[PDB]
Amino acid sequence: KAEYYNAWSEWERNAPPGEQRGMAVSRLRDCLDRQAHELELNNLGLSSLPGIQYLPNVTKLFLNGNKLTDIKPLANLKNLGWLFLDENKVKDLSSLKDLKKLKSLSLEHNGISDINGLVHLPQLESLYLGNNKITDITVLSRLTKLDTLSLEDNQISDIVPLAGLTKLQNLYLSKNHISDLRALAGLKNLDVLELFSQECLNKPINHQSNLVVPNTVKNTDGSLVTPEIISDDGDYEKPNVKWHLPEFTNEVSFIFYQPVTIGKAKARFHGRVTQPLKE
């Protein structure tokens, strides 16, 4: 504990060129001294953590509203059940690998794209990944104990990794790039499902005066969703969206609004497909 108090003072003096490192050192000492289960470090602006070697009574770590980029210091908090890292800048989760009791992880607004470190947390029950940069969700197929998964406001178009996650009950997928719901067809245990605000972007094609674009928006059974609104006087004749474009234009689009039911869960699958055109 002398060595701990010491490490923490050195760290307190390395604030980069508005971090509340005094308050943090106070909280760390209070936590260690009382062998507390909770270490509350929210909104301190911290850009790093010192060495923390042995807080094995700590089961709840609150770090919302800091600016951490490296969570290697958390690696030995092996008894953590709840970890909150909202609005940090963490971009690799491999340092969590020995946290086998972790049940809840919040990591909103970190800008993370590489979530492969989740492979080490098969017992996770709640995972909050809203507002990140996630395109590749293939790790999530390992997280078969999740009850709650937020993936909203990411860059996800391939949801196949969720297809076997039948335990899922709360699933937030709004503000992604999802046009095909088939991966959700077996998720009949859902209560909450959010699928609004999709913005899907086709690869460019050449402009033609008679344009014919296959519809790519699919229900959970693979059937095509009839567009609601089509740009530029276009029409729909399944399976195609059609336009007459006597002059070049650089894009056309269409909007879809589809009630979905998966088990008991009811949601609106609602979004836009954009088709860029090359002259």
State how far Cα 59 lies from the chain centre.
23
What is the spatial distance between Cα 249 and Cα 33, in angstroms, rounded to a whole number? 69
Partners of residue 149 on adjacent β-strands: 127, 171
Instruction: Look at residues 203, 220, 247 and tell me which one is the last residue of a structural domain.
Output: 203
Instruction: Look at residues 144, 174, 203 and tell me which one is the last residue of a structural domain.
Output: 203
Partners of residue 270 on adjacent β-strands: 257
| 149 shares a domain with 136 | yes
Q: Is 246 left (phi over 0), alpha (psi -120 to 50) or beta?
A: alpha
| 189 shares a domain with 215 | no
| 122 shares a domain with 150 | yes
What is the spatial distance between Cα 193 and Cα 266, in angstroms, rounded to a whole number? 7
| 168 shares a domain with 188 | yes
For residue 202, the 8-state DSSP code is P
The DSSP line for 34-83 is TT-SEEE-TTS--S--------TT--EEE-TT---S--GGGTT-TT--EE
What is the spatial distance between Cα 202 and Cα 218, in angstroms, rounded to a whole number? 15
- Identify the helix (H) or strand (E) that includes residue 6: helix 2-12
| 137 shares a domain with 64 | yes
Which one, of 55, 65, 66, 63, lies nearest residue 30 by Cα? 55
Instruction: Look at residues 203, 229, 251 and tell me which one is the last residue of a structural domain.
Output: 203
Q: Which domain holds residue 215?
A: 204-279
Tokens of 32: 């260690």
| 161 shares a domain with 213 | no
Q: Which structural technique was applied?
A: X-ray
| 238 shares a domain with 220 | yes
Number of domains forming the structure of the chain: 2
Contact residues for 209 (Cβ-Cβ < 8 A; gap 6+) = 244, 245, 246
Q: What is the CATH number of the domain that holds 53?
A: 3.80.10.10
Q: How far is CA 11 from CA 6, 22, 217, in A?
A: 9, 10, 53
Burial class (CB in 10 A: 0-12, 13-18, 19+), 90: buried
Tokens of 216: 């790519």
What is the spatial distance between Cα 245 and Cα 211, in angstroms, rounded to a whole number? 7
| 2 shares a domain with 126 | yes
Long-range contacts of 119-124 (CB under 8 A, 24+ apart): 120/94, 120/96, 121/96, 121/97
- How far from each other are the two terminal CA atoms of the chain, in whole angstroms? 70
Tokens of 236: 């729909």
| 244 shares a domain with 178 | no
Partners of residue 260 on adjacent β-strands: 267
| 276 shares a domain with 234 | yes
| 79 shares a domain with 28 | yes
For residues 145 and 166, is the Cβ–Cβ distance under 8 A? no
